[model samples]
Target: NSFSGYLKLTDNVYIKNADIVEEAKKVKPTVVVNAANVYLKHGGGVAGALNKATNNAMQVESDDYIATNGPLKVGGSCVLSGHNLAKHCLHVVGPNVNKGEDIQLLKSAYENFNQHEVLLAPLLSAGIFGADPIHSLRVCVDTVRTNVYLAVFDKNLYDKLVSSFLE
Candidate 1:
Protein backbone atom coordinates (compact mmCIF):
# COMPACT_ATOMS: atom_id res chain seq x y z
CA ASN A 1 0.00 0.00 0.00
CA SER A 2 2.97 2.31 0.64
CA PHE A 3 6.65 2.51 -0.26
CA SER A 4 9.36 3.69 2.10
CA GLY A 5 12.64 3.82 0.15
CA TYR A 6 14.46 2.46 -2.88
CA LEU A 7 17.57 0.37 -3.46
CA LYS A 8 20.05 1.84 -5.88
CA LEU A 9 21.59 -1.08 -7.71
CA THR A 10 23.71 1.20 -9.87
CA ASP A 11 23.86 4.83 -10.97
CA ASN A 12 21.09 4.12 -13.47
CA VAL A 13 19.04 1.42 -11.77
CA TYR A 14 16.89 1.40 -8.68
CA ILE A 15 14.39 -1.00 -7.09
CA LYS A 16 11.50 -0.23 -4.80
CA ASN A 17 8.46 -1.78 -3.22
CA ALA A 18 5.87 -0.05 -5.36
CA ASP A 19 3.40 -1.05 -8.01
CA ILE A 20 4.75 -0.55 -11.56
CA VAL A 21 1.35 0.60 -12.80
CA GLU A 22 1.19 3.31 -10.17
CA GLU A 23 4.80 4.23 -10.75
CA ALA A 24 4.14 4.73 -14.46
CA LYS A 25 1.16 6.91 -13.64
CA LYS A 26 3.14 9.06 -11.27
CA VAL A 27 6.52 9.27 -12.97
CA LYS A 28 5.17 9.38 -16.51
CA PRO A 29 7.87 7.09 -17.79
CA THR A 30 8.86 6.89 -21.46
CA VAL A 31 7.82 3.23 -21.48
CA VAL A 32 6.30 0.72 -19.13
CA VAL A 33 7.37 -2.87 -19.61
CA ASN A 34 4.84 -5.64 -19.10
CA ALA A 35 5.71 -9.28 -18.51
CA ALA A 36 3.22 -10.59 -21.03
CA ASN A 37 2.23 -13.82 -22.73
CA VAL A 38 3.36 -15.05 -26.15
CA TYR A 39 -0.04 -14.33 -27.69
CA LEU A 40 0.17 -10.69 -26.53
CA LYS A 41 -3.05 -11.24 -24.61
CA HIS A 42 -3.46 -8.91 -21.70
CA GLY A 43 -5.15 -11.56 -19.63
CA GLY A 44 -3.53 -11.59 -16.20
CA GLY A 45 -0.79 -10.37 -13.91
CA VAL A 46 1.00 -7.20 -15.04
CA ALA A 47 -0.60 -7.39 -18.47
CA GLY A 48 -4.12 -7.52 -17.07
CA ALA A 49 -3.51 -4.63 -14.69
CA LEU A 50 -1.95 -2.49 -17.42
CA ASN A 51 -4.73 -3.27 -19.90
CA LYS A 52 -7.41 -2.36 -17.39
CA ALA A 53 -5.59 0.85 -16.58
CA THR A 54 -5.31 1.74 -20.28
CA ASN A 55 -9.09 1.40 -20.75
CA ASN A 56 -8.75 -1.25 -23.48
CA ALA A 57 -6.28 0.74 -25.55
CA MET A 58 -3.56 -1.70 -24.63
CA GLN A 59 -5.74 -4.73 -25.21
CA VAL A 60 -7.02 -3.48 -28.57
CA GLU A 61 -3.52 -2.80 -29.83
CA SER A 62 -2.36 -6.15 -28.56
CA ASP A 63 -5.19 -7.87 -30.38
CA ASP A 64 -4.34 -5.97 -33.54
CA TYR A 65 -0.71 -6.96 -33.22
CA ILE A 66 -1.72 -10.60 -32.93
CA ALA A 67 -4.09 -10.28 -35.86
CA THR A 68 -1.33 -8.88 -38.00
CA ASN A 69 1.70 -10.65 -36.62
CA GLY A 70 0.40 -13.61 -34.65
CA PRO A 71 1.98 -15.05 -31.54
CA LEU A 72 5.45 -14.23 -30.21
CA LYS A 73 8.34 -16.43 -29.24
CA VAL A 74 9.35 -16.89 -25.60
CA GLY A 75 11.82 -14.01 -25.74
CA GLY A 76 9.98 -11.82 -28.21
CA SER A 77 8.87 -8.23 -27.64
CA CYS A 78 6.06 -6.04 -28.88
CA VAL A 79 6.13 -2.28 -28.66
CA LEU A 80 2.95 -0.21 -28.55
CA SER A 81 1.86 3.31 -27.82
CA GLY A 82 0.78 4.09 -24.29
CA HIS A 83 -2.26 5.85 -22.88
CA ASN A 84 -3.24 7.26 -19.50
CA LEU A 85 -0.09 5.76 -18.03
CA ALA A 86 3.15 6.27 -19.99
CA LYS A 87 4.32 7.23 -23.44
CA HIS A 88 4.53 3.59 -24.55
CA CYS A 89 4.39 -0.03 -23.48
CA LEU A 90 7.01 -2.71 -24.12
CA HIS A 91 5.44 -6.13 -23.85
CA VAL A 92 7.89 -8.98 -23.56
CA VAL A 93 7.12 -12.68 -23.35
CA GLY A 94 9.86 -13.84 -21.03
CA PRO A 95 10.85 -17.46 -20.66
CA ASN A 96 8.81 -19.75 -18.43
CA VAL A 97 11.63 -21.56 -16.69
CA ASN A 98 9.16 -23.94 -15.08
CA LYS A 99 8.39 -25.22 -18.58
CA GLY A 100 12.08 -26.08 -19.11
CA GLU A 101 12.77 -22.74 -20.74
CA ASP A 102 16.21 -21.16 -20.70
CA ILE A 103 17.26 -18.24 -18.54
CA GLN A 104 18.95 -16.69 -21.55
CA LEU A 105 15.50 -16.00 -22.91
CA LEU A 106 14.86 -13.91 -19.86
CA LYS A 107 18.11 -12.05 -20.51
CA SER A 108 16.93 -11.34 -24.04
CA ALA A 109 13.91 -9.64 -22.55
CA TYR A 110 16.09 -7.50 -20.29
CA GLU A 111 18.55 -6.55 -23.01
CA ASN A 112 16.05 -4.06 -24.40
CA PHE A 113 15.30 -2.26 -21.18
CA ASN A 114 17.36 0.62 -22.49
CA GLN A 115 15.31 1.00 -25.68
CA HIS A 116 13.34 3.79 -24.00
CA GLU A 117 14.08 6.40 -21.40
CA VAL A 118 12.83 6.19 -17.85
CA LEU A 119 11.36 2.71 -18.07
CA LEU A 120 9.42 1.01 -15.31
CA ALA A 121 9.58 -2.78 -15.10
CA PRO A 122 8.63 -5.56 -12.80
CA LEU A 123 10.63 -8.72 -12.06
CA LEU A 124 9.87 -10.37 -15.38
CA SER A 125 8.86 -14.07 -15.22
CA ALA A 126 9.42 -14.39 -11.51
CA GLY A 127 5.73 -14.46 -10.68
CA ILE A 128 3.61 -16.52 -13.05
CA PHE A 129 6.57 -18.03 -14.89
CA GLY A 130 8.00 -19.69 -11.77
CA ALA A 131 11.58 -18.44 -12.15
CA ASP A 132 13.71 -18.02 -9.07
CA PRO A 133 12.97 -14.59 -7.65
CA ILE A 134 16.50 -13.85 -6.56
CA HIS A 135 17.97 -14.85 -9.91
CA SER A 136 15.46 -12.74 -11.81
CA LEU A 137 16.27 -9.73 -9.66
CA ARG A 138 19.93 -10.30 -10.27
CA VAL A 139 19.37 -10.50 -14.00
CA CYS A 140 17.61 -7.16 -14.00
CA VAL A 141 20.34 -5.70 -11.87
CA ASP A 142 23.16 -6.97 -14.07
CA THR A 143 21.54 -6.57 -17.46
CA VAL A 144 19.61 -3.32 -17.75
CA ARG A 145 21.77 -0.62 -19.32
CA THR A 146 19.52 2.38 -18.90
CA ASN A 147 17.87 4.39 -16.20
CA VAL A 148 15.33 1.94 -14.78
CA TYR A 149 12.81 1.98 -12.03
CA LEU A 150 12.28 -1.59 -10.88
CA ALA A 151 8.90 -1.88 -9.20
CA VAL A 152 8.12 -4.73 -6.86
CA PHE A 153 4.63 -5.59 -5.61
CA ASP A 154 5.23 -7.83 -2.62
CA LYS A 155 7.19 -7.01 0.52
CA ASN A 156 9.20 -10.22 0.35
CA LEU A 157 10.11 -9.68 -3.26
CA TYR A 158 11.14 -6.12 -2.53
CA ASP A 159 13.39 -7.28 0.27
CA LYS A 160 14.96 -9.90 -1.94
CA LEU A 161 15.69 -7.42 -4.72
CA VAL A 162 17.18 -4.98 -2.26
CA SER A 163 19.40 -7.68 -0.83
CA SER A 164 20.80 -8.26 -4.30
CA PHE A 165 22.42 -4.86 -4.00
CA LEU A 166 23.74 -5.49 -0.49
CA GLU A 167 25.52 -8.69 -1.45
Candidate 2:
Protein backbone atom coordinates (compact mmCIF):
# COMPACT_ATOMS: atom_id res chain seq x y z
CA ASN A 1 0.00 0.00 0.00
CA SER A 2 2.92 2.29 0.80
CA PHE A 3 5.07 2.93 -2.18
CA SER A 4 8.54 3.99 -1.08
CA GLY A 5 9.21 7.70 -1.51
CA TYR A 6 5.45 8.18 -1.85
CA LEU A 7 5.79 11.85 -0.81
CA LYS A 8 4.42 13.73 2.18
CA LEU A 9 1.40 15.99 2.42
CA THR A 10 2.39 19.61 1.82
CA ASP A 11 2.93 22.00 4.66
CA ASN A 12 0.69 25.11 5.13
CA VAL A 13 -2.10 23.33 3.23
CA TYR A 14 -4.77 20.72 4.00
CA ILE A 15 -4.99 17.45 2.07
CA LYS A 16 -6.01 13.80 2.24
CA ASN A 17 -4.19 10.59 1.39
CA ALA A 18 -4.42 9.58 -2.25
CA ASP A 19 -6.94 7.05 -3.62
CA ILE A 20 -9.58 8.04 -1.07
CA VAL A 21 -12.30 8.96 -3.55
CA GLU A 22 -11.48 6.03 -5.75
CA GLU A 23 -11.57 3.62 -2.86
CA ALA A 24 -14.87 5.01 -1.68
CA LYS A 25 -16.32 4.29 -5.08
CA LYS A 26 -15.35 0.64 -4.94
CA VAL A 27 -17.92 -0.51 -2.35
CA LYS A 28 -19.69 0.75 0.73
CA PRO A 29 -16.59 -0.29 2.59
CA THR A 30 -16.67 -0.46 6.33
CA VAL A 31 -13.14 0.87 6.23
CA VAL A 32 -11.82 2.78 3.26
CA VAL A 33 -8.13 2.34 2.61
CA ASN A 34 -5.74 5.26 2.60
CA ALA A 35 -2.01 5.68 2.41
CA ALA A 36 -0.52 5.63 5.92
CA ASN A 37 -0.30 8.90 7.77
CA VAL A 38 3.43 9.46 7.97
CA TYR A 39 2.89 9.37 11.72
CA LEU A 40 -0.25 7.86 13.28
CA LYS A 41 -0.54 7.33 17.05
CA HIS A 42 -3.09 5.56 19.23
CA GLY A 43 -5.46 8.50 18.95
CA GLY A 44 -8.84 9.21 20.65
CA GLY A 45 -9.71 5.64 21.77
CA VAL A 46 -10.58 2.33 20.10
CA ALA A 47 -10.86 3.92 16.68
CA GLY A 48 -7.41 5.27 17.43
CA ALA A 49 -6.14 1.75 18.01
CA LEU A 50 -7.52 0.68 14.65
CA ASN A 51 -5.64 3.53 13.03
CA LYS A 52 -2.42 2.20 14.52
CA ALA A 53 -3.21 -1.28 13.25
CA THR A 54 -4.08 0.01 9.81
CA ASN A 55 -0.81 1.89 9.70
CA ASN A 56 1.26 -1.11 10.63
CA ALA A 57 -0.39 -3.37 8.03
CA MET A 58 0.14 -0.68 5.44
CA GLN A 59 3.80 -0.33 6.40
CA VAL A 60 3.37 3.10 7.93
CA GLU A 61 5.58 4.22 10.81
CA SER A 62 4.71 6.02 14.05
CA ASP A 63 7.96 7.95 13.96
CA ASP A 64 6.03 11.20 14.27
CA TYR A 65 5.00 10.37 17.84
CA ILE A 66 8.58 9.61 18.68
CA ALA A 67 9.33 13.31 18.35
CA THR A 68 6.12 14.64 19.82
CA ASN A 69 6.71 16.06 23.31
CA GLY A 70 3.18 15.22 24.45
CA PRO A 71 -0.14 13.86 23.22
CA LEU A 72 -1.02 15.53 19.90
CA LYS A 73 -4.19 17.37 20.67
CA VAL A 74 -6.42 19.03 18.07
CA GLY A 75 -7.33 22.68 17.67
CA GLY A 76 -8.47 24.85 14.79
CA SER A 77 -6.23 27.70 15.88
CA CYS A 78 -3.34 25.36 16.62
CA VAL A 79 -3.98 22.91 13.81
CA LEU A 80 -0.83 24.12 12.18
CA SER A 81 1.34 23.99 15.27
CA GLY A 82 3.72 21.23 16.43
CA HIS A 83 6.95 19.62 15.19
CA ASN A 84 6.21 17.42 12.16
CA LEU A 85 9.04 15.35 10.85
CA ALA A 86 6.49 12.59 10.20
CA LYS A 87 3.29 14.60 9.74
CA HIS A 88 3.31 18.10 8.30
CA CYS A 89 2.51 20.10 11.38
CA LEU A 90 2.68 23.84 12.16
CA HIS A 91 1.87 24.81 8.61
CA VAL A 92 -1.73 24.41 7.44
CA VAL A 93 -4.65 26.31 8.96
CA GLY A 94 -8.29 25.23 9.11
CA PRO A 95 -11.22 27.55 9.75
CA ASN A 96 -11.25 27.65 13.53
CA VAL A 97 -14.28 26.08 15.26
CA ASN A 98 -16.48 25.40 12.28
CA LYS A 99 -17.16 23.03 9.37
CA GLY A 100 -15.95 25.65 6.90
CA GLU A 101 -12.27 25.17 7.73
CA ASP A 102 -12.49 21.39 7.90
CA ILE A 103 -14.47 21.06 4.68
CA GLN A 104 -11.94 23.27 2.96
CA LEU A 105 -9.08 21.13 4.16
CA LEU A 106 -10.82 17.98 3.01
CA LYS A 107 -11.49 19.39 -0.43
CA SER A 108 -7.96 20.74 -0.70
CA ALA A 109 -6.50 17.36 0.10
CA TYR A 110 -8.72 15.59 -2.39
CA GLU A 111 -8.13 17.95 -5.30
CA ASN A 112 -4.37 18.15 -4.99
CA PHE A 113 -2.25 15.00 -5.03
CA ASN A 114 1.14 15.84 -6.59
CA GLN A 115 1.74 18.09 -3.59
CA HIS A 116 2.29 16.59 -0.14
CA GLU A 117 -0.49 17.47 2.31
CA VAL A 118 -1.55 16.68 5.86
CA LEU A 119 -5.28 17.00 6.43
CA LEU A 120 -6.08 17.51 10.12
CA ALA A 121 -9.83 17.66 10.78
CA PRO A 122 -10.37 18.83 14.36
CA LEU A 123 -13.47 17.98 16.38
CA LEU A 124 -15.59 21.09 15.99
CA SER A 125 -18.00 19.90 18.64
CA ALA A 126 -15.33 20.01 21.31
CA GLY A 127 -16.17 23.64 21.90
CA ILE A 128 -17.87 26.01 24.32
CA PHE A 129 -21.02 26.05 22.22
CA GLY A 130 -20.82 22.27 22.04
CA ALA A 131 -22.50 20.07 19.42
CA ASP A 132 -24.91 17.20 19.61
CA PRO A 133 -23.98 13.77 18.37
CA ILE A 134 -27.33 13.32 16.61
CA HIS A 135 -26.84 16.54 14.70
CA SER A 136 -23.34 15.48 13.79
CA LEU A 137 -24.73 12.21 12.50
CA ARG A 138 -27.16 14.16 10.38
CA VAL A 139 -24.28 15.87 8.64
CA CYS A 140 -22.73 12.56 7.67
CA VAL A 141 -26.02 11.04 6.58
CA ASP A 142 -27.29 14.10 4.77
CA THR A 143 -24.06 14.24 2.90
CA VAL A 144 -24.41 10.52 2.20
CA ARG A 145 -20.74 10.03 3.05
CA THR A 146 -19.98 12.00 -0.13
CA ASN A 147 -19.98 15.52 1.23
CA VAL A 148 -19.24 14.18 4.71
CA TYR A 149 -15.87 12.95 5.93
CA LEU A 150 -14.49 11.67 9.21
CA ALA A 151 -10.98 11.35 10.61
CA VAL A 152 -11.42 7.64 11.36
CA PHE A 153 -11.42 7.47 15.16
CA ASP A 154 -10.54 4.47 17.34
CA LYS A 155 -13.29 2.04 18.49
CA ASN A 156 -14.43 3.86 21.63
CA LEU A 157 -14.78 7.11 19.75
CA TYR A 158 -16.57 5.21 17.05
CA ASP A 159 -18.87 3.57 19.60
CA LYS A 160 -19.54 6.88 21.24
CA LEU A 161 -20.30 8.36 17.85
CA VAL A 162 -22.82 5.66 16.97
CA SER A 163 -25.46 7.90 18.49
CA SER A 164 -25.29 9.85 15.26
CA PHE A 165 -25.97 6.82 13.10
CA LEU A 166 -28.32 5.09 15.51
CA GLU A 167 -31.05 6.34 17.79
Candidate 3:
Protein backbone atom coordinates (compact mmCIF):
# COMPACT_ATOMS: atom_id res chain seq x y z
CA ASN A 1 0.00 0.00 0.00
CA SER A 2 1.01 3.60 -0.51
CA PHE A 3 0.64 3.94 3.26
CA SER A 4 3.79 1.81 3.61
CA GLY A 5 6.07 4.81 2.97
CA TYR A 6 5.33 6.85 6.11
CA LEU A 7 7.97 9.09 7.65
CA LYS A 8 8.68 8.77 11.34
CA LEU A 9 8.98 12.29 12.72
CA THR A 10 9.85 11.06 16.17
CA ASP A 11 9.21 8.02 18.28
CA ASN A 12 5.85 9.68 18.70
CA VAL A 13 4.68 10.83 15.27
CA TYR A 14 4.36 9.30 11.80
CA ILE A 15 2.98 10.57 8.48
CA LYS A 16 1.45 8.43 5.74
CA ASN A 17 -0.64 8.66 2.61
CA ALA A 18 -3.93 7.01 3.52
CA ASP A 19 -7.63 7.59 3.82
CA ILE A 20 -8.23 9.21 7.19
CA VAL A 21 -11.55 7.52 7.71
CA GLU A 22 -10.31 4.02 6.96
CA GLU A 23 -7.14 4.35 8.95
CA ALA A 24 -8.98 5.87 11.91
CA LYS A 25 -11.45 2.99 11.93
CA LYS A 26 -8.69 0.44 11.60
CA VAL A 27 -6.30 1.80 14.24
CA LYS A 28 -8.95 3.20 16.57
CA PRO A 29 -6.85 5.70 18.42
CA THR A 30 -8.01 7.13 21.71
CA VAL A 31 -8.03 10.66 20.38
CA VAL A 32 -8.11 12.18 16.90
CA VAL A 33 -7.43 15.79 16.03
CA ASN A 34 -9.92 17.26 13.63
CA ALA A 35 -8.54 20.03 11.43
CA ALA A 36 -11.66 22.10 11.48
CA ASN A 37 -13.16 25.56 11.11
CA VAL A 38 -13.66 27.84 14.10
CA TYR A 39 -17.37 27.18 14.12
CA LEU A 40 -16.91 23.37 14.39
CA LYS A 41 -19.00 22.61 11.35
CA HIS A 42 -18.13 19.25 9.80
CA GLY A 43 -19.79 19.70 6.44
CA GLY A 44 -17.03 18.54 4.12
CA GLY A 45 -13.66 16.84 3.75
CA VAL A 46 -11.99 15.05 6.69
CA ALA A 47 -14.28 16.68 9.20
CA GLY A 48 -17.35 15.53 7.29
CA ALA A 49 -16.23 11.90 7.11
CA LEU A 50 -15.21 11.90 10.75
CA ASN A 51 -18.52 13.44 11.71
CA LYS A 52 -20.38 10.71 9.90
CA ALA A 53 -18.21 7.97 11.36
CA THR A 54 -18.83 9.22 14.86
CA ASN A 55 -22.60 9.22 14.41
CA ASN A 56 -22.55 12.99 13.87
CA ALA A 57 -21.68 13.39 17.53
CA MET A 58 -18.55 15.37 16.75
CA GLN A 59 -20.30 18.58 15.73
CA VAL A 60 -22.79 18.43 18.58
CA GLU A 61 -20.28 18.35 21.44
CA SER A 62 -17.79 20.44 19.50
CA ASP A 63 -20.42 23.16 19.18
CA ASP A 64 -20.96 22.91 22.89
CA TYR A 65 -17.23 23.16 23.49
CA ILE A 66 -17.19 26.29 21.36
CA ALA A 67 -20.14 27.75 23.25
CA THR A 68 -18.50 27.10 26.61
CA ASN A 69 -14.84 27.66 25.80
CA GLY A 70 -15.20 30.47 23.23
CA PRO A 71 -14.48 30.29 19.52
CA LEU A 72 -11.58 27.92 18.77
CA LYS A 73 -9.13 30.17 16.98
CA VAL A 74 -6.24 29.01 14.82
CA GLY A 75 -3.94 28.37 17.75
CA GLY A 76 -6.54 26.97 20.13
CA SER A 77 -8.27 23.60 20.62
CA CYS A 78 -10.93 21.80 22.66
CA VAL A 79 -11.19 18.13 23.67
CA LEU A 80 -14.48 16.26 23.69
CA SER A 81 -16.01 12.76 23.92
CA GLY A 82 -18.51 10.66 21.87
CA HIS A 83 -16.79 9.13 18.89
CA ASN A 84 -17.01 5.50 17.75
CA LEU A 85 -13.27 4.85 17.59
CA ALA A 86 -12.02 7.55 19.91
CA LYS A 87 -13.24 8.65 23.29
CA HIS A 88 -11.90 12.16 22.80
CA CYS A 89 -11.85 14.22 19.67
CA LEU A 90 -9.59 17.23 19.77
CA HIS A 91 -10.96 20.02 17.65
CA VAL A 92 -8.10 22.14 16.39
CA VAL A 93 -8.94 25.03 14.11
CA GLY A 94 -6.16 25.52 11.64
CA PRO A 95 -5.36 28.72 9.73
CA ASN A 96 -6.96 29.79 6.48
CA VAL A 97 -4.01 29.16 4.21
CA ASN A 98 -4.86 32.11 1.99
CA LYS A 99 -3.69 34.35 4.85
CA GLY A 100 -0.30 32.57 4.65
CA GLU A 101 1.22 33.80 7.93
CA ASP A 102 -0.16 31.64 10.71
CA ILE A 103 2.40 28.86 10.91
CA GLN A 104 3.03 29.62 14.56
CA LEU A 105 -0.60 29.11 15.41
CA LEU A 106 -0.65 25.82 13.56
CA LYS A 107 2.40 24.71 15.49
CA SER A 108 0.83 25.79 18.75
CA ALA A 109 -2.30 23.82 18.06
CA TYR A 110 -0.25 20.67 17.52
CA GLU A 111 2.05 21.39 20.45
CA ASN A 112 -0.82 22.00 22.82
CA PHE A 113 -2.27 18.51 22.43
CA ASN A 114 0.75 16.45 23.39
CA GLN A 115 -0.98 14.83 26.35
CA HIS A 116 -3.07 12.30 24.50
CA GLU A 117 -1.73 8.76 24.54
CA VAL A 118 -2.50 8.29 20.86
CA LEU A 119 -3.72 10.80 18.30
CA LEU A 120 -4.51 10.74 14.61
CA ALA A 121 -4.72 13.84 12.44
CA PRO A 122 -4.85 15.22 8.97
CA LEU A 123 -2.42 17.58 7.26
CA LEU A 124 -3.91 20.76 8.68
CA SER A 125 -4.71 23.48 6.12
CA ALA A 126 -3.08 21.48 3.34
CA GLY A 127 -6.31 20.56 1.57
CA ILE A 128 -8.93 22.98 0.34
CA PHE A 129 -7.50 25.67 2.64
CA GLY A 130 -4.40 25.66 0.42
CA ALA A 131 -1.53 25.66 2.88
CA ASP A 132 1.81 24.47 1.54
CA PRO A 133 2.16 20.76 2.38
CA ILE A 134 5.88 20.95 3.07
CA HIS A 135 5.45 23.87 5.45
CA SER A 136 2.50 22.28 7.18
CA LEU A 137 4.42 19.01 7.55
CA ARG A 138 7.32 20.95 9.06
CA VAL A 139 5.02 22.48 11.64
CA CYS A 140 3.59 19.04 12.44
CA VAL A 141 7.03 17.52 12.85
CA ASP A 142 8.20 20.39 15.01
CA THR A 143 5.20 20.39 17.32
CA VAL A 144 3.74 16.92 17.64
CA ARG A 145 5.09 15.05 20.67
CA THR A 146 2.44 12.48 21.42
CA ASN A 147 1.98 9.16 19.65
CA VAL A 148 0.49 10.61 16.49
CA TYR A 149 -0.52 9.34 13.06
CA LEU A 150 -1.22 11.70 10.17
CA ALA A 151 -3.26 10.70 7.13
CA VAL A 152 -2.19 12.51 4.00
CA PHE A 153 -4.56 11.86 1.08
CA ASP A 154 -2.68 13.64 -1.69
CA LYS A 155 0.07 11.64 -3.39
CA ASN A 156 2.39 14.53 -4.29
CA LEU A 157 2.20 16.00 -0.82
CA TYR A 158 2.83 12.57 0.69
CA ASP A 159 5.88 12.13 -1.54
CA LYS A 160 7.26 15.50 -0.50
CA LEU A 161 7.11 14.59 3.18
CA VAL A 162 8.59 11.15 2.54
CA SER A 163 11.43 12.58 0.43
CA SER A 164 12.21 15.24 3.00
CA PHE A 165 12.38 12.66 5.75
CA LEU A 166 14.61 10.34 3.67
CA GLU A 167 17.08 13.14 2.79
| lDDT (Cα, tens digit) per residue for candidate 3, span 43-139 | 9988898898888877787778778877776777777773785667787787876766465677776775687767778888777777777788778
Order the candidate numbers by TM-score, best to worst. Answer: 1, 3, 2
Q: Scored by Cα lDDT, where does model 2 land?
A: 0.30
- All models, RMSD in angstroms: 2.7, 12.4, 3.0
**Candidate 1 regions off by >4 Å?**
1-5
The model with the greater TM-score, 1 or 2, is 1
lDDT of 2 by residue, 104-162 (tens): 33323332222322232322232221344334333323322222233333345445555
- Per-residue lDDT value at 66 in model 1: 90
Give all TM-scores, in the order shown. 0.91, 0.27, 0.86
lDDT of 3: 0.76
Q: Write the per-residue lDDT of candidate 1 for residues 1-167, one digit (tens) a residue.
A: 12236677788788888888887777787788889888888888888998999888888888888999989888778788878887788888889887888878888888878676677888888887888888887787788888777888898878766776687
Pairs that collide in candidate 1 are none
| Model 2 RMSD, rounded to 1 decimal | 12.4
Please give the clash total of every predicted structure, in order: 0, 15, 0
**Which TM-score value belongs to model 2?**
0.27
